[PDB]
Design an enzyme around this catalytic site. Structure first.
Site, PDB file in Angstrom:
ATOM      1  N   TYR A 124     -12.370   6.129  -0.655  1.00  0.00           N
ATOM      2  CA  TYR A 124     -12.853   6.027   0.718  1.00  0.00           C
ATOM      3  C   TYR A 124     -12.711   7.352   1.484  1.00  0.00           C
ATOM      4  O   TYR A 124     -12.026   8.281   1.037  1.00  0.00           O
ATOM      5  CB  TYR A 124     -12.129   4.888   1.463  1.00  0.00           C
ATOM      6  CG  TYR A 124     -10.617   4.880   1.380  1.00  0.00           C
ATOM      7  CD1 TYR A 124      -9.951   3.958   0.573  1.00  0.00           C
ATOM      8  CD2 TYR A 124      -9.850   5.765   2.141  1.00  0.00           C
ATOM      9  CE1 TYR A 124      -8.554   3.913   0.528  1.00  0.00           C
ATOM     10  CE2 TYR A 124      -8.456   5.734   2.106  1.00  0.00           C
ATOM     11  CZ  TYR A 124      -7.820   4.805   1.302  1.00  0.00           C
ATOM     12  OH  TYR A 124      -6.442   4.755   1.267  1.00  0.00           O
ATOM     13  N   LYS A 180      -6.721  -0.027  -7.116  1.00  0.00           N
ATOM     14  CA  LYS A 180      -5.555   0.811  -6.870  1.00  0.00           C
ATOM     15  C   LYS A 180      -6.032   2.247  -6.860  1.00  0.00           C
ATOM     16  O   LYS A 180      -6.446   2.780  -7.895  1.00  0.00           O
ATOM     17  CB  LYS A 180      -4.508   0.609  -7.962  1.00  0.00           C
ATOM     18  CG  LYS A 180      -3.910  -0.782  -7.978  1.00  0.00           C
ATOM     19  CD  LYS A 180      -3.265  -1.111  -6.645  1.00  0.00           C
ATOM     20  CE  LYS A 180      -2.733  -2.529  -6.637  1.00  0.00           C
ATOM     21  NZ  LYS A 180      -2.369  -2.952  -5.256  1.00  0.00           N
ATOM     22  N   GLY A 181      -5.973   2.868  -5.688  1.00  0.00           N
ATOM     23  CA  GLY A 181      -6.445   4.230  -5.551  1.00  0.00           C
ATOM     24  C   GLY A 181      -7.925   4.180  -5.200  1.00  0.00           C
ATOM     25  O   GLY A 181      -8.740   4.881  -5.796  1.00  0.00           O
ATOM     26  N   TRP A 240      -1.971   9.803 -11.193  1.00  0.00           N
ATOM     27  CA  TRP A 240      -1.275   9.889 -12.466  1.00  0.00           C
ATOM     28  C   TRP A 240      -1.514   8.588 -13.221  1.00  0.00           C
ATOM     29  O   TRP A 240      -1.779   7.539 -12.631  1.00  0.00           O
ATOM     30  CB  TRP A 240       0.220  10.087 -12.237  1.00  0.00           C
ATOM     31  CG  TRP A 240       0.577  11.510 -11.958  1.00  0.00           C
ATOM     32  CD1 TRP A 240       0.387  12.193 -10.788  1.00  0.00           C
ATOM     33  CD2 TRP A 240       1.143  12.445 -12.882  1.00  0.00           C
ATOM     34  NE1 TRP A 240       0.797  13.497 -10.932  1.00  0.00           N
ATOM     35  CE2 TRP A 240       1.263  13.679 -12.208  1.00  0.00           C
ATOM     36  CE3 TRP A 240       1.558  12.361 -14.220  1.00  0.00           C
ATOM     37  CZ2 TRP A 240       1.778  14.820 -12.822  1.00  0.00           C
ATOM     38  CZ3 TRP A 240       2.072  13.497 -14.832  1.00  0.00           C
ATOM     39  CH2 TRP A 240       2.176  14.711 -14.131  1.00  0.00           C
ATOM     40  N   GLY A 269       2.359   2.186  -3.088  1.00  0.00           N
ATOM     41  CA  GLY A 269       2.416   2.570  -4.493  1.00  0.00           C
ATOM     42  C   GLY A 269       3.366   1.686  -5.285  1.00  0.00           C
ATOM     43  O   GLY A 269       3.929   2.111  -6.290  1.00  0.00           O
ATOM     44  N   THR A 270       3.534   0.446  -4.832  1.00  0.00           N
ATOM     45  CA  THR A 270       4.428  -0.500  -5.487  1.00  0.00           C
ATOM     46  C   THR A 270       3.983  -0.909  -6.888  1.00  0.00           C
ATOM     47  O   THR A 270       4.822  -1.055  -7.791  1.00  0.00           O
ATOM     48  CB  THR A 270       4.612  -1.787  -4.639  1.00  0.00           C
ATOM     49  OG1 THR A 270       3.335  -2.374  -4.366  1.00  0.00           O
ATOM     50  CG2 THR A 270       5.316  -1.466  -3.326  1.00  0.00           C
ATOM     51  N   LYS A 279       0.790  -1.221   0.000  1.00  0.00           N
ATOM     52  CA  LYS A 279       0.000   0.000   0.000  1.00  0.00           C
ATOM     53  C   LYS A 279       0.829   1.282   0.000  1.00  0.00           C
ATOM     54  O   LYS A 279       0.409   2.292   0.555  1.00  0.00           O
ATOM     55  CB  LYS A 279      -0.959  -0.019   1.194  1.00  0.00           C
ATOM     56  CG  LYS A 279      -1.519  -1.413   1.524  1.00  0.00           C
ATOM     57  CD  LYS A 279      -2.137  -2.089   0.300  1.00  0.00           C
ATOM     58  CE  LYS A 279      -3.221  -1.207  -0.310  1.00  0.00           C
ATOM     59  NZ  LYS A 279      -3.658  -1.682  -1.649  1.00  0.00           N
TER      60      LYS A 279
HETATM   61  N1  LIG Z   1      -0.479   6.298 -10.183  1.00  0.00           N
HETATM   62  C1  LIG Z   1      -1.179   5.701  -9.242  1.00  0.00           C
HETATM   63  N2  LIG Z   1      -2.393   5.149  -9.548  1.00  0.00           N
HETATM   64  C2  LIG Z   1      -3.152   4.519  -8.596  1.00  0.00           C
HETATM   65  N3  LIG Z   1      -2.837   4.367  -7.315  1.00  0.00           N
HETATM   66  C3  LIG Z   1      -1.605   4.932  -7.004  1.00  0.00           C
HETATM   67  C4  LIG Z   1      -0.737   5.591  -7.884  1.00  0.00           C
HETATM   68  N4  LIG Z   1       0.386   6.010  -7.244  1.00  0.00           N
HETATM   69  C5  LIG Z   1       0.210   5.634  -6.035  1.00  0.00           C
HETATM   70  N5  LIG Z   1      -0.962   4.981  -5.799  1.00  0.00           N
HETATM   71  C6  LIG Z   1      -1.225   4.534  -4.396  1.00  0.00           C
HETATM   72  O1  LIG Z   1      -0.727   3.188  -4.128  1.00  0.00           O
HETATM   73  C7  LIG Z   1      -1.650   2.385  -3.328  1.00  0.00           C
HETATM   74  C8  LIG Z   1      -1.537   0.923  -3.697  1.00  0.00           C
HETATM   75  O2  LIG Z   1      -0.269   0.461  -3.398  1.00  0.00           O
HETATM   76  P1  LIG Z   1       0.230  -1.005  -3.549  1.00  0.00           P
HETATM   77  O3  LIG Z   1       0.340  -1.282  -4.973  1.00  0.00           O
HETATM   78  O4  LIG Z   1       1.528  -1.125  -2.815  1.00  0.00           O
HETATM   79  O5  LIG Z   1      -0.762  -1.987  -2.868  1.00  0.00           O
HETATM   80  C9  LIG Z   1      -2.947   3.057  -3.516  1.00  0.00           C
HETATM   81  O6  LIG Z   1      -3.956   2.669  -2.662  1.00  0.00           O
HETATM   82  P2  LIG Z   1      -5.170   3.394  -1.942  1.00  0.00           P
HETATM   83  O7  LIG Z   1      -6.180   2.548  -2.765  1.00  0.00           O
HETATM   84  O8  LIG Z   1      -5.336   3.027  -0.413  1.00  0.00           O
HETATM   85  O9  LIG Z   1      -5.376   4.878  -2.243  1.00  0.00           O
HETATM   86  C10 LIG Z   1      -2.703   4.632  -3.861  1.00  0.00           C
HETATM   87  O10 LIG Z   1      -2.881   5.621  -2.859  1.00  0.00           O
END
Ligand SMILES: Nc1ncnc2c1ncn2[C@@H]1O[C@H](COP(=O)(O)O)[C@@H](OP(=O)(O)O)[C@H]1O
Length: 282
Positions: A240, A236-237, A220, A24-25, A22
């Protein structure tokens, strides 16, 4: 438990994005794959984009099991947000890929904890759906085992320094990169630059030019032909509520010291302190 040694070859990842989760991997993983010279692994039908080899039960499957994930571009990378937190992954990874690059992404621990909670709710986790965020982070004397377990999963991975030390003992400082999770989400082209520079990228690509902020997405995305954007999936993103202010503050206090240690460690590692970290420390 074995310890696969360095077999030497070219069919091995040269960079490991260890998480945590969580932060931004998936986005770093997606944007990096856009560079014609960098190639990610092929997806798993069980762990998707992740391989999750060094962390747990998959590691005893051997080296060949791992190699199969990679193509037969001349620089591969894999991402498993489970490596960061893993106790055994560091030495296991260092034994097999001694020269590998290690990359980690950090965002404010409180938001990272909140995102995990929101993540478990999205996957319909009952403990996460049954208790509110504050109840999870303040889980106490009357808290159940499952509720306590969820709390650990939200907070423990946020002891950034503690885990970074485990990796720092298995890898030289100049083989590690601590990214600013806030900057990655807010100005991806800036960190995409540091990463390339860090990988020793021959032909650096400018992401400013071919990424774009998608307002309806709130993040982005990859810029395509004529305004068009290709964003990360719905998971992703997630959309909430902003976290409770009391909960935020509560967590601010709890990490204060962890954050103090982190600031010292990074400095000692020669890593620039994340924006979110400088603010929290003031
Ligand atoms: N370009 C991008 N598009 C979508 N989510 C992104 C992003 N850059 C960062 N994120 C972030 O990366 C999180 C997911 O990380 P991971 O891949 O490690 O599980 C997201 O979860 P949230 O859904 O809680 O906002 C969001 O805030």
């Amino acid at each position: 438990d074995p310890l696969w040694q360095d077999p030497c070859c070219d069919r091995f990842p040269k960079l490991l994005i260890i998480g945590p989760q969580k932060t931004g991997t998936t986005a770093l993983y997606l944007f990096l794959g856009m560079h014609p010279d960098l190639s990610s692994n092929y997806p798993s039908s069980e762990t998707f984009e992740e391989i999750q080899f060094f962390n747990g039960h998959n590691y005893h499957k051997g080296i060949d099991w791992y190699m199969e994930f990679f193509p037969i571009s001349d620089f591969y990378f894999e991402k498993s947000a489970n490596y960061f937190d893993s106790e055994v992954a560091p030495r296991r990874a260092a034994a097999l890929l001694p020269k590998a690059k290690v990359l980690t992404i950090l965002i404010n621990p409180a938001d990272r904890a909140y995102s995990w909670y929101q993540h478990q709710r999205a996957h319909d986790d009952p403990v996460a759906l049954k208790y509110t965020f504050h109840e999870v982070i303040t889980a106490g004397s009357d808290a159940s085992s499952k509720l306590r377990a969820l709390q650990n999963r939200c907070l423990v991975p946020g002891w950034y320094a503690t885990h970074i030390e485990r990796w720092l003992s298995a890898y030289h400082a100049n083989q590690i990169l601590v990214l600013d999770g806030k900057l990655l989400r807010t100005e991806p082209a800036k960190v995409m630059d540091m990463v390339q520079k860090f990988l020793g990228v021959t032909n650096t690509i400018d992401y400013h030019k071919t990424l774009a902020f998608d307002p309806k997405k709130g993040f982005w995305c990859q810029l395509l032909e004529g305004g068009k954007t290709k964003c990360l999936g719905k998971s992703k993103g997630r959309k909430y509520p902003e976290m409770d202010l009391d909960s935020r503050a509560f967590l601010k206090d709890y990490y204060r010291d962890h954050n103090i240690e982190l600031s010292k460690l990074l400095y000692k590692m020669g890593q620039t302190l994340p924006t979110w970290l400088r603010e929290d420390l003031q």
